[PDB]
Design a protein around this ligand. Structure first.
Ligand code: MG
Ligand code: MG
Ligand code: MG
Ligand code: MG
Ligand code: MG
Ligand code: MG
Ligand code: MG
Ligand code: MG
Ligand code: MG
Ligand code: MG
Ligand code: MG
Ligand code: MG
Ligand code: MG
Ligand code: MG
Ligand code: MG
Ligand code: MG
Ligand code: MG
Ligand code: MG
Ligand code: MG
Ligand code: MG
Ligand code: MG
Ligand code: MG
Ligand code: MG
Ligand code: MG
Ligand code: MG
Ligand code: MG
Ligand code: MG
Ligand code: MG
Ligand code: MG
Ligand code: MG
Ligand code: MG
Ligand code: MG
Ligand code: MG
Ligand code: MG
Ligand code: MG
Ligand code: MG
Ligand code: ZN
Lengths: 150, 129, 144, 155, 81, 87
RNA sequence: GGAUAGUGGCCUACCAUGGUUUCAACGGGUAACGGGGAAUAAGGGUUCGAUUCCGGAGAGGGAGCCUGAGAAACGGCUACCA
RNA sequence: GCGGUAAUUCCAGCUCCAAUAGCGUAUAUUAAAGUUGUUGCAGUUAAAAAGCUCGUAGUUGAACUUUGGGCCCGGUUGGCCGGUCGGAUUUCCAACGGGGCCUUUCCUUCUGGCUAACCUUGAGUCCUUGUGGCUCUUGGCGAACCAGGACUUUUACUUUGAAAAAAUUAGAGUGUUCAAAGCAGGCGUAUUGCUCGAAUAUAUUAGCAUGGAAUAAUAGAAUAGGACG
RNA sequence: AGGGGAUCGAAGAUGAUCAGAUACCGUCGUAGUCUUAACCAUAAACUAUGCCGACUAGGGAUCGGGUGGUGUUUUUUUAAUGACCCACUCGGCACCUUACGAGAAAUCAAAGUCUUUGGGUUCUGGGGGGAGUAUGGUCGCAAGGCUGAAACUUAAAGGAAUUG
C-alpha cells in the first residue's frame, strides 16, 4: 500500500455499522439534497460539500440520509463537472509543479515529483477512460493541461 | 495486495495451532473460505467457527482443537483430470488412510474421497491433515 | 515465494526462463554449440586413426617424476596434430615413426589423464594389430 | 465495405443468370436473388434490401458456407470488403502443466450486408478459397459497437 | 492467551484499541449541539470541524480546527448526541 | 490402530497433553503430570485419589503452563473466579 | 479475364494500400525428413528416432517434356553444368 | 594416489575375488542430479538482488448476486436373515450415490405432432382386519423430442462418449519339451469330424458430441438511446 | 567551454631516510578542489539482505501525530497558553531479552510460519582459472559504460566454526 511513497501508515475513516439512522437526525431528504445542490452551485467539490455538511450541518453520511452518493446527486442535477474531481486536483497540482520547474531548472526533486504525479494522472486517466466517463481519445498534455484547469 | 483470501485464512489457522492456541481471528472470509472450514469441521480437524458480520467482507472466529497437523492451499488452482487426483493425494498426503485433498468441482467444493464417490472433477483448492 | 512466477498462465515465462538458464549447463552448452564437431581432434567420434610424426618423452607432472613415452599423430581424416600415449611397459618400442596408429579417448571427456600434461588420447592400435596383443605376444606386428 | 456507386467498375456488376426483362415494365428495376446459409444465421435484411453485388457474399453470392464455424474479435477493417480477426486461446504446456496466451489472425471476407467496426465480436464460417488467404466469411455480428455514443460530450 | 474469547472481549481493552482494530470497526468521533447565549438557537457541530464553523446568523465563530477535535470557542456549552 | 480382525496391535498408545491435545512422547522429559488430590469433609486430603492433568513440555516452555492450569482446574471446579475467558 | 481437371495473386490488366510482429514477426543455425515409436524404470522428466509400418522427397545437379487414366517419370526422352 | 632398495599399486610366480561364453576399453546418452528445481534448488557472508525511483508489454489481482427448508422416485454395494436345490430376491436396517419436485424460482420461444406420467376414477378388488397391488377408458401434466417459424452475451475448467491402423507397450488365453517367441491349438468315432479362439486395456494436445454450474473471467440500465404489452 | 583559484593538494622538483626508496616523513607546487552551461553514469552506490500482502513473542527507550486528566510546575485573580508527568493508540530510526522456530555456522522477528516442500511478482547464480578477456553491437568528446563468448587448462577453489 501507498504506491509512490514507501509510506505505509493506515489512515482511513471507520464507517459506522448503522447503515441508516441517526434516528436523532431530523430534517429530510429534501433538506440535505437542497443543501448539496446549493453548495454545488457555490462551486464546491462533492468532498467540500460532504465536509461542510458533516461539521456545521448534522449530516454524518450524506449517502445514508439520501441513498445517493454526493457526486451522483450533482450529476443528476446537471452539476456534473467535465472531469472527475480527483483527476482535476492531480492535474492542477501537476501544472503548478511544472510552473515551479520552469522557473527553477536547477531543481531535480521537482522533475521527480512531476514525473510521479503525471504518471498517477495517466494511470487514473486510463481507468476513467475505460469506464465510459472519458472519451477513448482523452489524453493529458502539458501545453493543454495548463488551460484545462485554469 | 491481498491475493488468495483462502491462503491468509489457512496460514493463520496453522500458525495458531502451531503456537498452541485454540481460537483464530481470520480476515476477511469468503464463500470459499467458509466451504473450506465447513469441510474441515465436517471431518473434525476444527470445531466451530462464527462469521462475524462487519458491513465489509467479514471476519471468522474459528474454534480449533489440536488434532490438526497442517491444512493448506495449492496456490495455482490446478486442473485435475479425475485420475491425477490419485497423484495429488499421493504427493501431499502423509498416507493412504486419512487426510483429504479438497478441491473445486462442478458438483461443488469437496474432499477428494467425496469427489471420488460422486465422480466429478475440476480444480484443486487444497488439503487437510 | 522467491522469484519463479507461480501463476497459472506464466507457462511461457517458465519454459523460456528454463532454456535461458540451461545455457549455463555445460553439456547442454557443448551439445548445442557443436563443440564436439567443431573443436576436438576427433570428429566427435569414439576413436580416430592417424599417423605417427615424432616419438616423445613427456616430463611427468608433480609430485610425480618420470618420462611418459608418447607419439605425435596426425589425424588421417583431419590433419589435426595430436600428442597421444602408449600405455604399459615397452609398447613405445612397438611404434617407430611414420607408423599408422589408432587413437582413443582417455576417459575424462577431454581433460588429461594423470601426471601427463596435455595428453588427451592414448594409442589403441598400430599397423592394425593392437598394443595388448603385441605386448602379450599374442600377435606379431605386420611386415612393412 | 463498398458503400455507394454500385456500378463503379470497368465491368458491369450484376447477379448471374438473373435476367430482368426490359420488355416488361417492372416496378423494382433490378430483379434480385438470395438465400439463407443454413445452421440458423438469419440472412439479414440488409442483404435483401441492398443494391450491392459481391459474388462473395454468403447470402447474395455464389459461395456456400460449410466446414468450421468460428468466432473471433475483429481487429482490422482497412481492407475493402475484407477484415482480419484475432482469435485467441490458451495453450497447454505439459511440463509446467499450465497455459500461455496465444492467438492467430484469420483474414475473412465480409459482405456489405454487415457493417462492422473494430472491437465487434464476429461469427464467421468456412467457405471455399476466396482469396490467397481468405478461407472464411462473415455470418453474424454478436456485438454492435461497445458504447461509442455512450461516450458523448457533457451535460 | 492460548485460550481466550475472540468473540466477546471486554469493552475495556476494546476501549483503548484503534478504531479499525475493534471487533467491528466504527468511528470514535461524535456530534454536539453548541450554544453561545448571544442568540437563541443552538447548532449541530462535528467533533472534528476542519471547517471553522460559524453561527446561524451572527458572524461570531464557534470552533477552530486543529489536528484532532475542534477547540470550541470561548464561552460555549454543548451536548453529545 | 487395531487391524484386520479386532486385535489391537501396535504397542504404546501414548499420553496426550489435555492442554493442546497434542501427543506427549517419550523424550518429552520436559512434560508434566499434575496430581491434585480429592479433599473431603473439613480438610482431609484423601491419599490415593487424584484428579490429574497433563502438561506438554511445549506449553511449560512457552510459559503458558500457569494460565492454562488456572483455566483447566477452574472449569473442573477447584477454582472460583481468578481466570477470565476474556480480556 | 486468362489459365487449370478445378478454387485461388496461379498469372494478366486496371484499382486500392494494405498483410505479419515482444502472444517473438523477419533473419540465422540444424552434425533436421515428419509421425507410429526407442532408451532411461518413484513420479514429474530427460535424451533419441537415418533405419522393417504410415506419409513425404529424390534418382550426379538443375530445367524442360513426350506417352498416358495416372509421371514434370529418370532402370523415359531433350538441353545445359559436371 | 603408488614407485627414490625390506613396493598391501609397477614387472611376474603363487594364491584369492567379480562377472562367466562371454568380459575389457573409447565415445555418446539416461538414472545417481533437489547440479536446471512445475513437482523441487540456490542468492548476508560460499556462485547470485540492477545505485535508485517511474513505467509499457507480461504475469497477477479483496469481499458480495438461489441459500435454506419439505416431499417424491428408483438404483449398488454391505449387513441380519435364505426361500433354495455355490447363487437367488423380498421385507428390517443403516451407508453411499443418480433423478424429479414445492417453496415469489425460464425451461429460449410460440404454432401441433406424442403423449410417459397422475391432481385423475371408472368399476372394484388378487389378498395379511388395508392406500401393501396392476390390468383398467370418458372431464384433467408437458416438455420426452419431433419440425416449422421466431431469437440466442462471450469463455476457461471438468465429465462421459463418439471418431479413431496395425507392429510396438501393459495385458488375458494357450505347456513353442523351457524360454525369447508364435497365434496358435484342443477334443474323438484318430474310417471320411467335434470345437474354444485370434481378447481387454492406453490412445493425452486439438477438433466434434454430452452431463455438470463450484472456482476464474466475460457482456448488461446512468444525458435512460433501458425492461416487458 | 567561462568564472574562480584562500585551503588542502594526483603530477612534477626536491630534503632526508634505505642496502636500494621512482614511496612512507618534510618542502615547493601544476591539474584539481568551489561555481555556471554541457557530458560522463561508475563505488564495499552496503542492510554485502527485491517489492506488495498475511500470520507467528516479550521488553523498556526514543521521533511524529492523536486521544484520554478534579497529573506537576508557569501567577495575576483562576484561568488560557507553553513546557513537563503518566496511560493509550497509529506510524518512524534502533536497541534489549528470549527463542516455539531457522541455518553450515557466525547469527536471524526474518535470514521464521520448507520433504507437513504452492499468497502475488521482478531479477540473478549452476565448480575453479581462462576473463569481464576476445568478438560484434551500441552509447561517449575522451577516459570508458552496457551487452558479452569460446578454445584451453584444472581437483579443488570456497564459507563458517574449532584446535593449534
Ligand atoms: Mg496496509
Ligand atoms: Mg508501484
Ligand atoms: Mg491520513
Ligand atoms: Mg554467465
Ligand atoms: Mg613438437
Ligand atoms: Mg484496400
Ligand atoms: Mg484457378
Ligand atoms: Mg493487409
Ligand atoms: Mg539433413
Ligand atoms: Mg529428429
Ligand atoms: Mg524416420
Ligand atoms: Mg543423415
Ligand atoms: Mg537402410
Ligand atoms: Mg520422383
Ligand atoms: Mg550417386
Ligand atoms: Mg527426372
Ligand atoms: Mg538404375
Ligand atoms: Mg523408377
Ligand atoms: Mg565450368
Ligand atoms: Mg614386493
Ligand atoms: Mg601383482
Ligand atoms: Mg504440479
Ligand atoms: Mg517429491
Ligand atoms: Mg545447488
Ligand atoms: Mg558472494
Ligand atoms: Mg532496465
Ligand atoms: Mg475474486
Ligand atoms: Mg438431490
Ligand atoms: Mg613524487
Ligand atoms: Mg613517481
Ligand atoms: Mg556494479
Ligand atoms: Mg515488539
Ligand atoms: Mg493533552
Ligand atoms: Mg522463535
Ligand atoms: Mg517440525
Ligand atoms: Mg594433486
Ligand atoms: Zn451564535
Amino acid at each position: 500500500g501507498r504506491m509512490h511513497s514507501a509510506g505505509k501508515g493506515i489512515s482511513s475513516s471507520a464507517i459506522p455499522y448503522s447503515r441508516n439512522a441517526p434516528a436523532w437526525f431530523k430534517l429530510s431528504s429534501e433538506s440535505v439534497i437542497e443543501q448539496i445542490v446549493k453548495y454545488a452551485r457555490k462551486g464546491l467539490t462533492p468532498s467540500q460539500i460532504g465536509v461542510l455538511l458533516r461539521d456545521a450541518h448534522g449530516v454524518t453520511q450524506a449517502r445514508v440520509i439520501t441513498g445517493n452518493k454526493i457526486m451522483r446527486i450533482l450529476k443528476s442535477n446537471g452539476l456534473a463537472p467535465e472531469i472527475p474531481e480527483d483527476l482535476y486536483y492531480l492535474i492542477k497540482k501537476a501544472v503548478s509543479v511544472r510552473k515551479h520547474l520552469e522557473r527553477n531548472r536547477k531543481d531535480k526533486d521537482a522533475k521527480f515529483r512531476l514525473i510521479l504525479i503525471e504518471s498517477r494522472i495517466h494511470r487514473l486517466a486510463r481507468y476513467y477512460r475505460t469506464v465510459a466517463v472519458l472519451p477513448p481519445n482523452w489524453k493529458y498534455e502539458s501545453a493543454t493541461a495548463s488551460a484545462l484547469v485554469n | 495486495t491481498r491475493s488468495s483470501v483462502l491462503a491468509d485464512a489457512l496460514n493463520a489457522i496453522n500458525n495458531a495451532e502451531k503456537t498452541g492456541k485454540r481460537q483464530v481471528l481470520i480476515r476477511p472470509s469468503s464463500k470459499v473460505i467458509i466451504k473450506f472450514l465447513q469441510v474441515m469441521q465436517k471431518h473434525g480437524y476444527i470445531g466451530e467457527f462464527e462469521y462475524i458480520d462487519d458491513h465489509r467482507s467479514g471476519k471468522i472466529v474459528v474454534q480449533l482443537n489440536g488434532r490438526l497437523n497442517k491444512c493448506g492451499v495449492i496456490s495455482p488452482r490446478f486442473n485435475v483430470k479425475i485420475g491425477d487426483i490419485e497423484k495429488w493425494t499421493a504427493n501431499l498426503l502423509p498416507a493412504r488412510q486419512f487426510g483429504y485433498v479438497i478441491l473445486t468441482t462442478s458438483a461443488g467444493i469437496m474432499d477428494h474421497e467425496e469427489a471420488r464417490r460422486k465422480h466429478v472433477s475440476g480444480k484443486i483448492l487444497g488439503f487437510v491433515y | 515465494g522467491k522469484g519463479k512466477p507461480r501463476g497459472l498462465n506464466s507457462a511461457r515465462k517458465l519454459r523460456v526462463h528454463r532454456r535461458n538458464n540451461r545455457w549455463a549447463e555445460n553439456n547442454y552448452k557443448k551439445r548445442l554449440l557443436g563443440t564436439a564437431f567443431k573443436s576436438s581432434p576427433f570428429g566427435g567420434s569414439s576413436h580416430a586413426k592417424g599417423i605417427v610424426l615424432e616419438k616423445l618423452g613427456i616430463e611427468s607432472k608433480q609430485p610425480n617424476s618420470a618420462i611418459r613415452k608418447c607419439v605425435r599423430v596426425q589425424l588421417i581424416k583431419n590433419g589435426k596434430k595430436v600428442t597421444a600415449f602408449v600405455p604399459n611397459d615397452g609398447c613405445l618400442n612397438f611404434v617407430d615413426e611414420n607408423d599408422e596408429v589408432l587413437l582413443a579417448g582417455f576417459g575424462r571427456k577431454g581433460k588429461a589423464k594423470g601426471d601427463i600434461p596435455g595428453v588427451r588420447f592414448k594409442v589403441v592400435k598400430v599397423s592394425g594389430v593392437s598394443l595388448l596383443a603385441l605386448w602379450k605376444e599374442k600377435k606379431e606386428k605386420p611386415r612393412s | 465495405s463498398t458503400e455507394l456507386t454500385v456500378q463503379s467498375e470497368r465491368a458491369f456488376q450484376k447477379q448471374p443468370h438473373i435476367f430482368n426483362n426490359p420488355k416488361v415494365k417492372t416496378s423494382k428495376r433490378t430483379k434480385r436473388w438470395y438465400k439463407n446459409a443454413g445452421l440458423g444465421f438469419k440472412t439479414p435484411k440488409t442483404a435483401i434490401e441492398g443494391s450491392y453485388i459481391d459474388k462473395k457474399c454468403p447470402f447474395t453470392g455464389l459461395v456456400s458456407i460449410r466446414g468450421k464455424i468460428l468466432t473471433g474479435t475483429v481487429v482490422s477493417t482497412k481492407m475493402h470488403r475484407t477484415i482480419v480477426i484475432r482469435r485467441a486461446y490458451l495453450h497447454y504446456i505439459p511440463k509446467y502443466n499450465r497455459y500461455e496466451k496465444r492467438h492467430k489472425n484469420v483474414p475473412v471476407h465480409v459482405s456489405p450486408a454487415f457493417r462492422v467496426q473494430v472491437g465487434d465480436i464476429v461469427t464467421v464460417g468456412q467457405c471455399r478459397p476466396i482469396s490467397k488467404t481468405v478461407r472464411f466469411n462473415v455470418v453474424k455480428v454478436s456485438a454492435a459497437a461497445g458504447x461509442x455514443x455512450x461516450x458523448x460530450x457533457x451535460x | 492467551v492460548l485460550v481466550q474469547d475472540l468473540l466477546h472481549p471486554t469493552a475495556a481493552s476494546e476501549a483503548r484499541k484503534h478504531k479499525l482494530k475493534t471487533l467491528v470497526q466504527g468511528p470514535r468521533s461524535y456530534f454536539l449541539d453548541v450554544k453561545c447565549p448571544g442568540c437563541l438557537n443552538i447548532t449541530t457541530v462535528f467533533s472534528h470541524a476542519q471547517t471553522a464553523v460559524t453561527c446561524e446568523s451572527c458572524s461570531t465563530i464557534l470552533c477552530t480546527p486543529t489536528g484532532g477535535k475542534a477547540k470550541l470557542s470561548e464561552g460555549t456549552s454543548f451536548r453529545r448526541k | 490402530m487395531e487391524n484386520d480382525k479386532g486385535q489391537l496391535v501396535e504397542l504404546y498408545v501414548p499420553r496426550k497433553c489435555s492442554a493442546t491435545n497434542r501427543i506427549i512422547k517419550a523424550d518429552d522429559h520436559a512434560s508434566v503430570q499434575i496430581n491434585v488430590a480429592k479433599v473431603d469433609e473439613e480438610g482431609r486430603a484423601i491419599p490415593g485419589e487424584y484428579v490429574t492433568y497433563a502438561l506438554s513440555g511445549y506449553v511449560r516452555s512457552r510459559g503458558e503452563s500457569d494460565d492454562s492450569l488456572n483455566r483447566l482446574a477452574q472449569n473442573d471446579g477447584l477454582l472460583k473466579n481468578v481466570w477470565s475467558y476474556s480480556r
